[model samples]
Target chain A: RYCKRTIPPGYKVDQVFGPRTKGKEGNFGDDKMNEEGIKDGRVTAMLNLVPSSHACLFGSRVTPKLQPDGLHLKFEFTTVVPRDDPQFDNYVKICDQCVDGVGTRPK
Target chain B: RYCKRTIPPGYKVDQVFGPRTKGKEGNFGDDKMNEEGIKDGRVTAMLNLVPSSHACLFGSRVTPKLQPDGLHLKFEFTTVVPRDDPQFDNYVKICDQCVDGVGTRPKD
Candidate 1:
């Protein structure tokens, strides 16, 4: 679930995961068991995770410390992203434009 | 990047994101621009996220307190998942089986 603070603007929200009972978040024991098919290969699992980094390192093992080679390897980081990103105000506009583009663009 | 503690075992790791040079994390100014194609509709956005909930409500707006109808509505939470889930040790095994299945499953 998206962190409440980061929900896109204009998107409506409701108090979800209502008040807990019997010291539990919410009862999903039976349904969860039924959905075990996802883990058992009966169903494909789709995770909405973004890849933060992708790289092929030159080594046989991974370690916290690294020694880079000057010729072929160089240390780098793409730290342009920030944690407290501003709420995108033009989300609806972007969606509208994308919809129009899809409608007009020849397949 | 995956959290260090949660990375699947056997996957190599490195001290990614070198030490910040200008008190910054990493340099990606030009590279980020080159990838602007994703947001502008040049490429598809694929977020590896899961849907936490899905439901249909009857109302003009969503509110904190839901007024449920006795015959057709019920509020329930499938509280099966846990926050600190254990590492999946059979990941590789599952992957291997999936690959084989894909290779052998007949296609129409």
Candidate 2:
């Protein structure tokens, strides 16, 4: 259900999508609806995505500008697919694993 | 650990991220490395993502061009954010929840 109390660790269970229900609210993070499902699961996943060492403020209603507490923590997951899919493996090898984490690290 | 049998339903168990262990391989899906982590969580996530109604072929090395079985299922999760973040709330209202899924369905 990925709902209240059932949300996986490092995740928040805000009102992401689907029918609006009492006690459930929306807008915990930037989200969009696609044929995929309700909202961008990635964005919704980050809403509660606390670091392995940090406390989650899932229900705290905290924002960047409104950092009431000491720490103003934010977790985001962004992605960039290779301009070429089938050729992605080749590009990583040419980059010396910098793109894929194999050889010398990039600068 | 989100690994192996522990993976959530509608997902497959394949080599996703992290150091290469004896049995763990890479490239279950297109992956990238950002400051965020090893690979894009979204892409790793969809790799094992199965539908409530479909059986996931996570462990199987299946691709669109190589559908050995009857079902040829693919799951993807793409995102689009309004250029205006603070104004996202307002944009929803004007669009009648189309973007947020409260109003009429899009062309589909």
Candidate 3:
């Protein structure tokens, strides 16, 4: 629920998946590397806050501007797809895949 | 801001891109066909409501269940790329393209 110094305060107003660390030798990493850990925290938080059975991807947000102000935020969601819907499995599968690979993209 | 009978009343709270039309023999169409016209109206509405220079392809949504209740909504957006950013043109280009072909698909 609470993030320590590992996450910057700017995270509240801005986007910082994780903080950039400067450890001696190979023990250090950048914010990008810490992003994976952040998602783990998010997944943990969601399950902790809600009933796992009722939890879903919820929704996604995208902005062409990485750090935009006065920009529009768009969402794609629906109440039409019930949990028991035939396509439900595919829905969950996509969420799983997204959580599985949120950091260190091939690009 | 306002839609006539061509769009169902349910459209106010539900999703009915457009109304199905019953034209003459070959001129008839369904809700799917009406979706295109609906989008055109949306574009027209957006531009009418705001400055065309600032309007853009906001985002998209998907529903595997087609018609669900108590569902979730997802979004993808960013604030890093400024309006004058190099990628801004590409961003608008994609929006223009999406609006170009949304009603029909050449699914195999």
Candidate 4:
């Protein structure tokens, strides 16, 4: 797998289930939205990229910083909850509920 | 940098802010408490290793799996909040307070 403009170059790195990197985004070049997609497997493991930040409500990278990067850019993996895995399904459900609530939030 | 028995071998991988891997632990050889230390930076960088999971109260690795692993082994860093970074101080304070409370929390 190749990521077009969607994912930045040099950011595609391999991560296993237990021992992972610890960035908010996939890598410096990647984006939070992309990390979100990757965890959703809107992008798949054939691409083999997921984000630790995306799994939690904080969605990774919540350290108060000198530079306030959008929550999207947080990279790295320090947890075992992958999106495809059964444990991660709850995260998926919550995100979906949140998204739907937002879409209907106007009322 | 080198690690002894506290850390296992071949698990020292490099990480940067914003572009981290997505595993529960830092690498196979490291442990949850170690990641806890790193994010706490109870160990420092240069020895430079903090844990993304440790940053959050969740600490890392919450995957339901074929095998149940302790919360300890989750690895990798995927955030800008380093233990030494000013932002990380809050985590430090909380941990300290919690530790103190644990010392104090009795039914008496």
True contacts kept of each: 0.01, 0.00, 0.10, 0.06
Task: Give lDDT per model, in order.
Answer: 0.20, 0.22, 0.26, 0.27
DockQ per candidate: 0.03, 0.02, 0.08, 0.05
Q: Give the local distance difference test score of model 2.
A: 0.22
Q: Write one digit per residue (lDDT tens) for candidate 2, span A1-107.
A: 11112223333223223321121122122212112222334423322212111011111111121122221211121122233445334432322311112122223
Per-residue lDDT over A13-84 for candidate 1, one digit per residue giving the tens place of the 0 to 100 score:
222323212222222112221223123121111111111222111110111211231111121211111223
Tell me the lDDT of model 2 at A56: 13
Q: Which window of ten consecutive residues has the lowest lDDT sum in model 2 chain B? A: B53-62
C-alpha lDDT of residue A61 in model 4: 27
Residue B66 of model 1, lDDT score: 17
**Candidate 3's error at B14, in angstroms?**
6.8
| Candidate that would win on lDDT | 4
For every candidate, C-alpha RMSD to the true structure in Å: 21.4, 21.5, 16.7, 17.1
Q: What C-alpha lDDT does candidate 4 achieve relative to the native structure? A: 0.27
Candidate 3 structure quality by residue, lDDT tens digits, A7-98? 33223211322222122111112233334433433333222211111011111111222334322423221223356756555545433333
Candidates, ranked, TM-score:
3, 4, 2, 1
* TM-score for candidate 1: 0.15
In model 2, the Cα lDDT at residue B72 comes to 20
Instruction: Estimate, for each residue in B1-108, the C-alpha lDDT of model 2 and write its tens digit.
Output: 111112333333222233211211221221121122223343333222121111111111111211232212111211222345454444223223111221132332
- Model 2 chain A poorest ten-residue lDDT run: A53-62
lDDT of 1: 0.20
Give a tens-digit lDDT track for model 3, residues B65-104: 2334522422221222346655555544433332223234
